[PDB]
Ligand binder design. Structure first.
Ligand code: ADP
Ligand code: ADP
Ligand code: ADP
Lengths: 370, 49, 24, 66, 49, 370, 370
């Protein structure tokens, strides 16, 4: 039957969820499963083995965090099943899995097997009435109130650029590169090892994520700023320690614009955006340059878009008006857009029937993938 | 005129037979899909056992 | 706005439109 | 379904759909009704605007009716 | 022209009758084959029961 | 039933139509059917699967263009039907295909099947009360005042020469080659490929047309600029790129004067006209050399008049006065002539009624072909 | 005085070489430039900073491979200078460029700047006494020993057809699309990314090429084989792992007959051959449909010509004998023919001497294009 549908954004690091017709995701919690790595002696301790949810951040000094989704592709399927059940848990949604149409998102160009296996989970473990899997870009266009644009996002693990012109998506112009937030944080962790801090545990890694979200900032000209010393921010650990970052506060998010630093022949995020535009036709290049829509949490770096303008302006043709729109709700654009598309009747004319899935299987979702 | 009369009769009655045989084919196509699902059920029966 | 406060991370005090200047 | 009733009822409701959707379009075309959607678009409450532009079957209705 | 209309009407209707009989009878074959598979699945399931 | 006949200039490059009596054609949209290439994902996108005219000129990049008519001969009847339906649509005329007489032009020497099927469409799909098929030569004379002359038109697909003297056409002197604007654009495309700029998509083919119309001229001499290897004038593309051309903005339009470049033995446009004059009667040469009318969009190149004069002057006998009347309405001359002819009352006697066609058929059209 | 000329056969992916009068190209190496990615630390490492030849293949994991000739057009002249010097180096020829004539090969319809810059390279850097740029179809006809034929070759980056009847080439019936082996390799990389295998490294593209050249076949019925979920054959690696290719080993070579898979509207290889024959004369079609000669590397797939026969039968007129003659020397046919062409006597007068280039310049090579 069709009750109020549920939108779930499988952000490779932060999963965002809520019902359709809403206006904000009230269920935002990081994506992992934390199991304890210590010994239990005192009866009356914490509860349960796995610790998905806010309890993880509340007791991170005990857990051994494991990420289920690496680069948008799920590795530990059992963890994603536990996380999805936690989304339907009594602390997050309280509904039953056999009650709502599910609007699952997905990073573009993910392997076929990922969609297939997600279908198996949602129609065998959960017995959902309906399911639809879509691109993350289209949703951001819904949440940004537009129809034409190039959604250049940066989730926690996959950055990509999808150029959509007047609601028509151009698949051959999609550029995907697997270097996002986790790689920025991982590279920053390596820099702190060279600064003498040796963060190597799992909880230490999420402390690095907190640093990346708070102390880093992007460059404008990394040589102008490389020849001069900087602020050297003093971040305080929860323990009470004191860490200094130095020039790595701007060298850490340089990995996005240049994967040569991490030792990887790939393209910058600017090259992804510019190529994604240029892989398309010629009559549309000017309009796509005039409508660049960001989303994704790894575009929230301070001083990011200004460097993006200097970069694309350095690459795009002469005097073309490059116009980047970056809203405040970039972190939830895919969720808000999922709510917008799921709050329609075309959505009823757009999902995949449970019966039809049982009759067909993988071929059903690969036909209705767009 | 009689040629068109008798041939409209022939073409329409033959397409009526098309309707019958097409119904039978579609019914067994659904039957094929049904035993695909049934084979999957029995596969789960053998698996559980 | 409260709707863009209640959430954990939001670009507070940042220009929303990045665009090249005039003088084409 | 025009399998039942008379043809007059059919002709009359097709005509009624014409004048009905016609007046509905007159309602929508008014600047205040559009102004409300403009305010919503300014407040970014895209749920209402997008649902009003795509979920209202008025487009295909006016097409098939005309 | 009317005799050519006789041709095409007979040709199209009868050919599609033949093609429908081909798909339908091939699925009847598939139904008997699949029924043999039904018997095998019931045998394996009932044996494990 | 009749009120203001509908004149239609069924030209293979651009279709010009309006009512009778109108001094100017109100609707001149290009003759192509635009279908999308990229899948629609986002709801609320563009509607329909067929884009014609103004819509298929703004969203050109999203489309794939299929020309229906090529060399004055219809290939896909479906497409021509859709274009004619577009003409009678709300955005173009808001009329019915049963209340107005229809004057549809045609190039000379077209096969009988075009006339037959054209009338079948206008008498079966459209229930047009009156249809009259004309020549695309007489109409230019009407719209230019003259009654004696050599109509040398060069549409986008077929150029020809019709010598008309005092209202009498001499059909055996009609020369017709199928080499015009399309071939010039296509050959310009091959020159850009030799200059390193490829174009293969159908949507980018109109950019080649745009180059032709905005940058191609005709040198007065074929060798005074050939070995000179002139400057490379730049030309901007719709995105903001840059194309320098040089030896192709004059080498591409010489295809009309010598089609040996395309690898086809035929006669050049000058030989078309001169042979059409020389095939006529001995007494009628001076009046035809002093009455040359130009029409068609390909007769708008820079230096076209000077080249045409010098070529005819080389081929005509000595001291014969050669006047080439070149009006400013070379694109709409045939249409304006149609608006004149349909505004007369002799046209009532010249058309074909519906019952005339029903009782007779194609025979009635071949009877009133002239 | 003159010596034995050098046949520097180009290629978009493989550059062949060898002296004239030979029978086997004794010095074949891929046309790519490899420079180190990592940092040299030890003393006694590899030296050179640019590695071309078998040494580059020996250290693929250490070099950032990049091709300088894309779609037959030279994109990096400096890298081509290095490659041509490597041809004359002490590892492949051990001779001097000042003592030998050069027979360079180019694809048809190339930009004039390639010929002009090739002239400046071989006449200003290399002080070659005589250069003669030839086509590639004629050479394969020389290699097979025939006089007539439709040479349908498919290099790494350019597939083209040049119908030649009795030693006479038709420069207007030459089709040429930039969709070949390298692009099929890139498309296969895309399908392996859709199957769950990353190959983003440029040095890993060679592994993708090995997959294409070793476990790919052309299915006769495309979608009929697409519906059947194949055995998913396992292929090794230059690592030791195992990849299950699956369905992406038959639809990956379907790009050659369906350029729609890459999103670019163009013709298929079969359409190139059929259109190259139909664009020729009327009395020259049975002999051209008979003598169909293949060449190029990409024409080595399993069942290539069998599907070619099927498609040609779908496009050629009824009951016409077709002979797709594919010799076993399809890879080196152009070089064998270059040896035969340079080993003749008229070749002495076919080239462009150094004095001729000093007198005229680029004009001399442009005059002797065929
Ligand atoms: N204020 C911030 N500054 C820099 N990076 C941030 C900030 N907030 C979030 N991020 C990055 O965004 C990531 C959140 O990933 P996210 O974009 O939510 O994935 P998804 O969007 O697919 O859910 C975090 O891991 C963090 O690295
Ligand atoms: N200003 C111009 N200069 C040169 N050529 C033009 C110009 N404008 C249009 N053309 C060419 O002439 C064609 C105009 O079509 P037209 O001559 O009307 O063909 P038709 O007569 O069949 O409608 C265009 O397709 C274009 O090829
Ligand atoms: N045995 C093979 N099977 C299939 N494809 C091959 C084989 N050998 C080479 N190729 C393809 O052919 C290309 C080389 O073709 P080649 O004739 O050298 O092109 P060119 O001469 O233009 O460089 C390689 O890139 C490869 O993709």
């Amino acid at each position: 039957i069709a009750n109020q549908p549920v939108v779930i954004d499988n952000g490779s690091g932060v999963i965002k969820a809520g019902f359709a017709g809403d206006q904000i995701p009230k269920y935002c919690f990081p994506n992992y499963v934390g199991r304890p790595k210590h010994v239990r002696v005192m009866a009356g301790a914490l509860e349960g083995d796995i610790f998905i949810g806010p309890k993880a951040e509340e007791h991170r000094g005990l857990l051994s965090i494991r990420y289920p989704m690496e680069h948008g592709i799920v590795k530990d399927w059992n963890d994603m099943e536990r996380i999805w059940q936690y989304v339907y848990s009594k602390d997050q949604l309280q509904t039953f899995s056999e009650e709502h149409p599910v609007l699952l998102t997905e990073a573009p160009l993910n392997p076929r097997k990922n969609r297939e296996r997600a279908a198996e989970v949602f129609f065998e473990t959960f017995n959902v009435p309906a399911l639809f899997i879509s691109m993350q870009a289209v949703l951001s266009l819904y949440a940004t109130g537009r129809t034409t644009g190039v959604v250049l996002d940066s989730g926690d693990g996959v950055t990509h650029a999808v150029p959509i012109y007047e609601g028509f998506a151009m698949p051959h112009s999609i550029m995907r590169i697997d270097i996002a937030g986790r790689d920025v944080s991982r590279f920053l962790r390596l820099y702190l090892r060279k600064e003498g801090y040796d963060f190597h545990s799992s909880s230490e890694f999420e402390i690095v994520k907190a640093i990346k979200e708070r102390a880093c900032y992007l460059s404008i000209n990394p040589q102008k700023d490389e020849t001069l010393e900087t602020e050297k921010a003093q971040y305080y650990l929860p323990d009470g320690s004191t860490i200094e970052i130095g020039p790595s506060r701007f060298r850490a998010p340089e990995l996005l614009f240049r994967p040569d630093l991490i030792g990887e022949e790939s393209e910058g995020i600017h090259e992804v955006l510019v190529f994604a535009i240029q892989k398309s036709d010629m009559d549309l290049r000017r309009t796509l340059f005039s409508n660049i829509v960001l989303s994704g949490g790894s575009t929230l770096f301070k001083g990011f878009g200004d460097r993006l303008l200097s970069e694309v302006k350095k690459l795009a043709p002469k005097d073309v008006k490059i116009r980047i729109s970056a809203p405040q709700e970039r972190l939830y654009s895919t969720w808000i857009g999922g709510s917008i598309l799921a709050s329609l009747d075309t959505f009823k004319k757009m999902w995949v029937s449970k019966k039809e899935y049982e009759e067909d299987g993988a071929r059903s979702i690969h036909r209705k993938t767009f | 005129r009689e040629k068109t009369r008798a041939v409209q009769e022939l073409s329409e009655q033959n397409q009526r037979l098309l309707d019958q045989l097409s119904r039978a084919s579609e019914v067994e196509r659904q039957l094929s899909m049904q035993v695909h699902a049934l084979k999957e059920d029995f596969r789960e029966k053998n698996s559980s056992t | 706005d409260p709707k863009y406060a209640d959430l954990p991370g939001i670009a507070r005090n940042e220009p929303d439109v990045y665009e090249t200047s005039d003088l084409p | 379904d025009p399998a039942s009733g008379t043809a007059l009822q059919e002709i009359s409701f097709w005509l009624n759909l014409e004048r009905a959707l016609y007046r509905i379009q007159e309602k929508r075309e008014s600047p205040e009704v559009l102004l409300t959607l403009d305010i919503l678009k300014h407040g970014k409450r895209f749920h209402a605007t997008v649902s009003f532009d795509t979920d209202t079957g008025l487009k295909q209705a006016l097409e098939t009716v005309n | 022209e009317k005799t050519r209309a006789v041709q095409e009407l007979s040709e199209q209707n009868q050919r599609l009758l033949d093609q429908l009989s081909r798909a339908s009878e091939v699925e009847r074959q598939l139904s008997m084959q699949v029924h043999a598979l039904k018997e095998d699945f019931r045998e394996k399931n009932s044996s494990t029961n």
